[PDB]
Every structure is written in structure tokens, then in C-alpha cells.
């Protein structure tokens, strides 16, 4: 009965395509045609964080908008005070092949992971005055690409084994497993209310999942290559993806289809990271061309360029209060832009 | 800058000192990436991620084995070399080996990384050629029109074995020279899973790679 199932799947795909087409009464460009342009945005490098002796792979801001954790290929996880450029902590790692890091919203823990297939959770605020490995979460059969905290006890990890996992830290067991991607899951983004989350993979596909039910609620397919970065809109109703297609795309969850495409003929390099500003008007995307572009999220016009890095911009993030943007690159330097 | 801020700055300076010491001690080891198939016999070349350390002439080598897309290959764009192991005795899977070698050679993050190619299991290749039960012509037609160029070890030399092994090497060397552009080189070697010179071969090839990099950097060649 394989052929009958294939025909039914094709019919369902056609039905979904027709449903998405029916809802497209007008485009975002015809609605924001009359909104005022942002203008030229010129952000300067306020502080340059030095101390990493290898490529920087990930950074994550703390919820206080002052402390940030960065991960480097030299086996180091460094916690910085951004205002004074003071190294608050330096954590050695058992594996130097790190691809992700996370900062708990409470600030008590940090997360790390990579080619060892293990999410290591380190406890910062402890007696004895030294950071210790609180937990090692194992169970993924591939490398860890991204990890995000929900609280001090729940963590969501994305892996290269095509799956995602919701772990209870105290028990150490996968409370939920998310399956459905046919390729390597590269990025993960938690919703502001922390009930849904989106994951982009190397299928040129992004999936919207429900944490409590464990099922895939939606699938978005607009890209032509691997989706390397994904980020939620501040209101939790839309999200942006960046691919190796040298293209970003803004998708809407309630319309269940793509809203906008950010692309330029002079851009032929992949997109490593994307992020939104506090109001959602700006979209900051990092590239392999050694710089970052600031797009007007409503008009698809490139509002500005941040061009201070001497190698591939591997990570970028925006503080919760929207004051500063941190970019980390392969030149072993983090930069703060305001 | 209060007293607590001064103490925090002193703590940061101590952290910087420790980081510098750790980086200096880490930058004394040559990192290598081991690649191959299940039939290759990669783990017998010398002596998540498996790491093997060895030392030749007071130089420390650290090899990493992970495990087709290889998205993680970007992590190894700064390694000294890639050690690619091929089972040259398997004529059925040799085209897969050639395709994998071509994929690794033309990777955009590996454009400046040389490859030390080990054509492994020469005992089995010799037995297959001398037995005559399997023929390379059944898989690579051009072997019918191939002549041995002029060069081979004497202790047990047989023209058919030499011709077969030189053809198998020439396939990979042609893949290498198609788009090498001089940025990186391929170093082909023949092994038998009983030799003890593989560490020496990697040592010599790494010395050659570093010599070429120094020639380019120091504005000599």
C-alpha cells in the first residue's frame, strides 16, 4: 500500500499549498510600502573582548544584559562582564570541539556542547569558588548544534542526528524527543512564552514544535540550502531564518507561510547567524564575508553594515534591553556594537 | 574604579595569564584529522570523537576520528593535515573512495589543507592480482589501456601488482591535480596494516607541509 500512501501524501501537499495560496491576499511589501524608512544605521565598536586563542563558535547574553558567555575552539568557555571587559570566569572544557553555549536565565548555570554529543551544564554560583561540571547529558547520537534553557531544570538541545531533545537536568534523562527532520538540525529558537520553539535543519526546512505535547505543529519550506540560523520575532508570531542560499526569510506562524525575503545580488555568501532587535524592526544577520548586515525587517532594505571583523562572523546576539549587539567571529575576537 | 573593581581587574589579569599559558602549551601539538570508510582500517594506521596521541622525534601528534554530508568539517579547517585511508583491495567500493576523496579535496573549508593518502591493505591487493579471480578491468575500463610508467621495490616485485597499484594511486593523484592549484598537496603512501613506519611517514609529510607553508609565508617562494 506504499503507492496509495504516496498519492495521499501528494494530495495533502497540494491541499496545503492551495490553503497557503488562498490566504495570500496581499504581500508584506504592499503593506509596508508607506512606512517611513529607518535610514542609515552607523553602529560603532564600543568594546572589543580579547582573550580567546582560537575561533569563537558561539556566544549568549545573560538576562541581565551585562554578562555574556562565549565558547572557543581552544577548549575555553569564558564569562565576560561586558561593561568593564572583565573576564568573570574561565572554564576549561574536556572537549575542545564546541559548537554551542547557553546562559541560564537565572544566571546560575551555563551550557556547552559540540562534537562529543554531550551537553555539559556547569554550575557558576557555588561554594568553593570554582565552576564545576554540574551535569553531563548524553543520548544524542550526533553532534550538538544548539542548546537553550527553559529554566534551571529544563534544557532543549538540537543535534546533528536529525533530532531535538528536552532534558530534565536533575534526572539527566530526555523527557521529550522531537523527530521529523530529515537532516542535521542546525539552529534552535525558544518562543518568548517558552511553549513553542522552531528548529531549522539542513533540509532547507524549519519546524515549529510544541514542547509540552512533543509534536511538530508546522513545517516551513522556502529555502534552497541548509538553514544555519533561526530566531523568533519578539511577539512570538513570526520567525526569521538564514541559509547558505545567501538569503534570510521571515515566516509567519498564523499565516503558515513565508512573509518576506531578505536578499541582495551582491551577497553570495552563507548566513551564519540572525537576530532581531528589541522592537523587531531591525534584523541583524552575520555572514561568511567577514561582516554583518542590518536589514529593515518591514521593508527588506539593508539599513546598515557592521564591518569590523577580520574573519567569518560565527555568532551574533542582542541584549534583552536592546542596548548592544555582540558579534563573535573566527578572528578570536568578540565585539560590542551600539 | 572602586576597590572591588580593582580586585576584579586583578582577577581578570590572572585569568589572562593562565589563558596565555594554556594556549602556549596547546600550540605545541600537531593536530590531524583521520578519515576513511569502515573497511579502511583507520584505527590500525599508527600502533563522539576518538583521540589518539603519539610522538615522533620529540614532536607530538594528535589525531581525531569522528564517528557523508560532513557539516562538522568546518571545525577542522585549521588542522595540519587530513589522513585519508583507502582500502585499495576492494574494487567494488573503490569508486566510493574516489568520490569521497574528491568531495574532501574540493571542500571549501579544506582548500588549504594537505591530505596524506594511505592506500591500505596492499597484501590483499597483491593476493587478488596474483590469484586472477577479480580484475580491475571489470570496474575501471581504462585499466586495459594503462601502461606502467618509468621505480618499484625489488623484494617480491611482480609487474601485474605494480601496474595495479600504480593505476589505483594514479586515480587519486589525478583527482588531486585536477584542482589542486598548488595551495595543498596529496601525499600517497602504500601500507599493509603490519608496518610500523606510518608515524614516520606522517612525520615527514607534516615536515614537508610546514616547510611549504613557511616558504609561502616568509616570502621565499
Amino acid at each position, epitope marked *: 500500500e506504499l503507492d496509495q500512501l504516496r498519492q495521499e501524501a501528494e494530495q495533502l501537499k497540494n491541499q496545503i499549498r492551495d490553503a497557503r495560496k488562498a490566504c495570500a491576499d496581499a504581500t508584506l511589501s504592499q503593506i509596508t510600502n508607506n512606512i517611513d524608512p529607518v535610514g542609515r544605521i552607523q553602529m560603532r565598536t564600543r568594546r572589543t573582548l580579547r582573550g580567546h586563542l582560537a575561533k569563537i563558535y558561539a556566544m549568549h547574553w545573560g538576562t541581565d544584559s*551585562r554578562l555574556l558567555v562565549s565558547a572557543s575552539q581552544d577548549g575555553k568557555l569564558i564569562i565576560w562582564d561586558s561593561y568593564t571587559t*572583565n573576564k*568573570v570566569h574561565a572554564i576549561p572544557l574536556r572537549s575542545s570541539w564546541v559548537m554551542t553555549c547557553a546562559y541560564a536565565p537565572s544566571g546560575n548555570y551555563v551550557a556547552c556542547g559540540g562534537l562529543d554529543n554531550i551537553c555539559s551544564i556547569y554550575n557558576l554560583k557555588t561554594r*568553593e569558588g570554582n565552576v564545576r561540571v554540574s551535569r553531563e547529558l548524553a543520548g544524542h547520537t550526533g553532534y550538538l548544534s544548539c542548546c537553550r534553557f527553559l529554566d534551571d531544570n529544563q534544557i532543549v538541545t538540537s543535534s546533528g542526528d536529525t533530532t531535538c531533545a528536552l532534558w530534565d537536568i536533575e534526572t539527566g534523562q530526555q523527557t521529550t524527543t522531537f523527530t521529523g527532520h530529515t537532516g542535521d538540525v542546525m539552529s534552535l529558537s525558544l518562543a518568548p512564552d517558552t511553549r513553542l520553539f522552531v528548529s531549522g535543519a539542513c533540509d532547507a526546512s524549519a519546524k515549529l514544535w510544541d514542547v509540552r505535547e512533543g509534536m511538530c505543529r508546522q513545517t516551513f519550506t522556502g529555502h534552497e540550502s541548509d538553514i544555519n540560523a533561526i530566531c523568533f520575532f519578539p511577539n512570538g508570531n513570526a520567525f526569521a531564518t538564514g541559509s547558505d542560499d545567501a538569503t534570510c526569510r521571515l515566516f509567519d506562524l498564523r499565516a503558515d507561510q513565508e512573509l518576506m525575503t531578505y536578499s541582495h545580488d551582491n551577497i553570495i555568501c552563507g548566513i551564519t547567524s540572525v537576530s532581531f532587535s528589541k522592537s523587531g524592526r531591525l534584523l541583524l544577520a552575520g555572514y561568511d564575508d567577514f561582516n554583518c548586515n542590518v536589514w529593515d525587517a518591514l521593508k527588506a532594505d539593508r539599513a546598515g553594515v557592521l564591518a569590523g571583523h577580520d574573519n567569518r562572523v560565527s555568532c551574533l546576539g542582542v541584549t534583552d534591553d536592546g542596548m548592544a549587539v555582540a558579534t563573535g567571529s573566527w578572528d578570536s575576537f568578540l565585539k560590542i556594537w551600539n | 574604579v572602586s*576597590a572591588e573593581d580593582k580586585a576584579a581587574a*586583578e582577577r581578570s589579569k590572572m585569568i589572562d595569564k593562565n589563558l596565555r599559558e594554556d594556549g602556549e602549551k596547546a600550540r605545541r601539538t600537531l593536530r590531524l584529522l583521520l578519515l576513511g570508510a569502515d573497511n579502511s582500517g583507520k584505527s590500525t594506521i599508527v600502533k563522539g570523537i576518538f583521540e589518539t596521541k603519539f610522538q615522533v622525534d620529540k614532536v607530538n601528534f594528535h589525531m581525531f576520528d569522528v564517528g557523508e554530508r560532513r557539516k562538522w568539517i568546518q571545525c577542522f579547517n585549521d588542522v595540519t593535515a587530513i589522513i585519508f585511508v583507502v582500502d585499495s583491495s576492494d574494487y567494488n567500493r573503490l569508486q566510493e573512495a574516489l568520490n569521497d576523496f574528491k568531495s574532501i579535496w574540493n571542500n571549501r573549508w579544506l582548500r588549504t589543507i594537505s591530505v596524506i593518502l594511505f592506500l591500505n591493505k596492499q597484501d590483499l591487493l597483491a593476493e587478488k592480482v596474483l590469484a586472477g579471480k577479480s580484475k580491475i578491468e571489470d570496474y575501471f575500463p581504462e585499466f586495459a589501456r594503462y601502461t606502467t610508467p618509468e621505480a618499484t621495490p625489488e623484494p617480491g616485485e611482480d609487474p601485474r601488482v605494480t601496474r595495479a597499484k600504480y593505476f589505483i594511486r594514479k586515480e587519486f593523484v589525478d583527482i588531486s591535480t585536477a584542482s589542486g592549484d598548488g595551495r595543498h598537496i596529496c601525499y600517497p603512501h602504500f601500507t599493509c596494516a603490519v608496518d610500523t613506519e606510518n608515524a614516520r611517514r606522517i612525520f615527514n609529510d607534516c615536515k614537508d607541509i610546514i616547510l611549504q607553508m613557511n616558504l609561502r609565508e616568509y616570502n621565499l617562494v
Partner: single-chain antibody
Framework: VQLVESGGGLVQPGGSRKLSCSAS????????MHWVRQAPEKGLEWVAY????????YYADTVKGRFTISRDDPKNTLFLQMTSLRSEDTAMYYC??????????????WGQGTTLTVSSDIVMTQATSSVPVPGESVSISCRSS???????????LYWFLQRPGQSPQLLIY???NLASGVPDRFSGSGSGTAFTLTISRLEAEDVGVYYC?????????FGAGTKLEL
């Protein structure tokens, strides 16, 4: 975590003695260390400080030139060599660990001190020496001669409690932050040169002497100490 003092005893004036503190249960090399002395019937007085790595060493003016503070990190030991001992050096000496980074809690642990018997500064003022109090709110006020609010937003004021027969323990750091292990009924409030520690629903085991200390500049100065009594 444990800090054990040793040495002490009765000495003649003009002599010398070395006090020692053995550290256990924590990474001693990452902590700065303080020697703080208390006279037999008086308040706390800061004596000396040595930074992590022995980079910075500070001495109080009353002991500068006679006391030497040192540390042996491999042996996890802290030493105070006292020469030219005077009658005013008769006191109980405490060793205090103190780590400094963004969000740290300095002066968090104190050791049970050792007794020694011999035969420009910011002045911290505590309004009352005694106030009688089970189940009622108690407000302890403190003042400084100089504003403790730094330009970086921090108000460097600390509240300690010393129970009878015990070494003082940290209650509040930077005028609002509750120390780890301290019940939430303690609160701290105030502006520059005006500080208040509020104890809501006072219980037993909360009776002792309360000290306000400034960490804005050296030398570190304590208040006289407010005593609660039942």
C-alpha cells in the same frame, strides 16, 4: 569550607608571634584573604588584606610596619607575622575569605579566631549600642561620613551578625543583597550615608551584635555594633 586559626597565647611586649590559618573545603588560591581583629570587649577592626596571587597587600595604619601578611597557596595557609607587640594588640583574630568579581559576595565566610594577649578614614556610626526586642520588626540604622554610592551604581555597605561565642557571619552585601543561607526576613535599604537593616518577624538565634562595614575604600572600617537583647 573551613578556616582554622592557630598560634596566639600570652606574649610579652616587644616580642613577636606568627598566627596561622589553615583553609579547607574551597579553592584557597582564588580567594583574597583578610585578617580582622576584635578587642576583648570592643568591636571589629580590620587588620590586613592579601590579594589572590599575593599581588596586592594592604595594612591598617595602626599595624603598618609591624605586621606582615603572607600566604602559602600550595599549603593552603595564611600567615600573620607580628613583631613589636603592644598591649593594644590583645584581641581575637579572624581570617576572612573574600573573592571579587561581578556579583560576588565578599566576606562570606569567617573562621573561629585565635586569642592573642599582651602583658581620611570613613567613620561608620551606629546610632545605638543596644535595643531590646520575638515576632517584632527591628530596624538597625547606620551612617557614614562619606557617601558609599559609587559612580558605577554600587553602594558598598555590608551587614554582619556576631552571635555570642561565634565568629561574625555575613548578612547583607552592597546594601541590598542577601547572603547565601540567610533567611529572607532580613532586608537592607538606604541611600548614601543612611542605611537600615530591617528584621521582620524576629526569631531566636537572631540575637547578637550587628556591624555595618564599608568596602568603598581602604582601610575598611566597621561600626561600633548594635546589640539586640531579649
Amino acid at each position: 569550607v573551613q578556616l582554622v586559626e592557630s598560634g596566639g597565647g600570652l606574649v610579652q611586649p616587644g616580642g613577636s608571634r606568627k598566627l596561622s590559618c589553615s583553609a579547607s573545603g574551597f579553592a584557597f588560591s582564588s580567594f583574597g584573604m583578610h585578617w580582622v581583629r576584635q578587642a576583648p570587649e570592643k568591636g571589629l577592626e580590620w587588620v590586613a588584606y592579601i590579594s589572590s596571587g599575593s599581588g596586592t597587600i594592604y595594612y591598617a595604619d595602626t599595624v603598618k610596619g609591624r605586621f606582615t601578611i603572607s600566604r602559602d597557596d600550595p599549603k593552603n595557609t595564611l600567615f600573620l607575622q607580628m613583631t613589636s607587640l603592644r598591649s593594644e594588640d590583645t584581641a581575637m583574630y579572624y581570617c576572612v575569605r573574600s573573592i571579587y568579581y561581578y556579583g560576588s559576595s565578599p566576606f562570606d565566610f569567617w573562621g573561629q579566631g585565635t586569642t592573642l594577649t599582651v602583658s581620611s578614614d570613613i567613620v561608620m556610626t551606629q546610632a545605638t549600642s543596644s535595643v531590646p526586642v520575638p515576632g517584632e520588626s527591628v530596624s538597625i540604622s547606620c551612617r557614614s561620613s562619606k557617601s558609599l554610592l559609587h559612580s558605577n551604581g554600587n553602594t558598598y555597605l555590608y551587614w554582619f551578625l556576631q552571635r555570642p561565642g561565634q565568629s561574625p557571619q555575613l548578612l547583607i552585601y552592597r546594601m541590598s543583597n542577601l547572603a547565601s543561607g540567610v533567611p529572607d526576613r532580613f532586608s537592607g535599604s538606604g541611600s548614601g550615608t543612611a542605611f537600615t537593616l530591617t528584621i521582620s518577624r524576629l526569631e531566636a538565634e537572631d540575637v547578637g551584635v550587628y556591624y555595618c562595614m564599608q568596602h568603598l575604600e581602604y582601610p575598611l572600617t566597621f561600626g561600633a555594633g548594635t546589640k539586640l537583647e531579649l
